[PDB]
Amino acid sequence: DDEYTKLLHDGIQPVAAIDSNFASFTYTPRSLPEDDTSMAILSMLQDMNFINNYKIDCPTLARFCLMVKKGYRDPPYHNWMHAFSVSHFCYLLYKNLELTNYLEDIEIFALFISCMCHDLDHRGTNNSFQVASKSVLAALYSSEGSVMERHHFAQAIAILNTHGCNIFDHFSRKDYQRMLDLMRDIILATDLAHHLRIFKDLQKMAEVGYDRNNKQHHRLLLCLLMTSCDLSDQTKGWKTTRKIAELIYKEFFSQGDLEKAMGNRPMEMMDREKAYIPELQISFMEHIAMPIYKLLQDLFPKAAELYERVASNREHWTKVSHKFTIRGLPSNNSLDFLDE
Ligand SMILES: Cc1nc2ccc(C(=O)NCc3ccccc3)cc2n2c(-c3ccccc3)nnc12
Ligand SMILES: [Mg+2]
Ligand SMILES: [Zn+2]
DSSP states (O other): OHHHHHHHHSOOOOHHHHOTTTTSTTOOGGGSOGGGHHHHHHHHHHHTTHHHHTTOOHHHHHHHHHHHHTTOOOOSSSSHHHHHHHHHHHHHHHHHHOGGGTSOHHHHHHHHHHHHHTTTTOOSOOHHHHHHTTOHHHHHHTTTSOHHHHHHHHHHHHHHTSTTOOTTTTSOHHHHHHHHHHHHHHHHTTSHHHHHHHHHHHHHHHHHOOOTTOHHHHHHHHHHHHHHHHTGGGGSOHHHHHHHHHHHHHHHHHHHHHHHHTTOOOOGGGOTTTOOHHHHHHHHIIIIIHHHHHHHHHHOGGGHHHHHHHHHHHHHHHHHGGGGSOOSOOSSOOOGGGOO
16 A cells, blocks of 8 residues: 555656656666656656546556556566556657647547556467467467457456546546447557558558548557557667567577477577577568558658667667677687587
């Protein structure tokens, strides 16, 4: 209760008081210490005027925010700080790219809340592993796909249906249903499999030009912005990309270890013996990350800097790829590592 007490009664700090650069793309939200992140969630909500506009109950909101935070486990990458930094990028798009000209207020509110909840209760493993290991989640959800993402959605709903946690309690039936509909759509788009299916449609949308009167264009745009948030670590400095590669490949390799204890051949990228991290990083950037921010740039001309930094961070990887080949002796002055 003490964290809840202080988060509820101390008041909401202004976004500038968190960091002077808080509303800028150049700022890295991972540098904020975890114990401050719940306050920063409230301050962003305050600053986007969602608390006032939707008359969100503050006691309810405090509990909800902490419940979402304590709904994340602690694998190398898919932990609370990922959700937080993903939500922050959603805040950055609101401040810097004028989402109100494209999207309804409620759709913008949904995206931000979806960002907070999109990876709840993740276990450092992807959808394929759920079927392979025959986990509880596959048993539930494998027949429509997007296993983890459906679980992510279900967990967020469980948080809403916990007593005193339903930040939308006072919404009309029609607003409540719209908000949960949005959360379904938005969270399921976090499966990169989904993104790859809607990619042609996203290109179509960019070519012809955005149409605020077109209901499909809203749905498509909402998906693109979610993925943009989900991969937003790539739009920062080189250093952030470096660290995030380290965290995800730790997570991934751990899965591989389990897969081959269960007698399966992991996919190259899960395999610590086979995975060449430089080619995999560049490949993810080229085929997945870069074209997303290209499309984001195509729809928002003010999002050019984001594509530019991802493109530059890709160049940075190619330049450092040679450090993965050992020259001379490895500073041990030993070649004991070869006895196998
Ligand atoms: C840095 C990085 N590399 C990834 C490499 C590889 C992958 C990854 O899952 N690739 C395989 C894949 C691609 C397309 C569709 C289905 C499966 C993800 C990476 N990633 C993410 C991420 C992970 C899971 C879900 C959503 C996003 N976020 N950052 C990364
Ligand atoms: Mg996910
Ligand atoms: Zn994610």
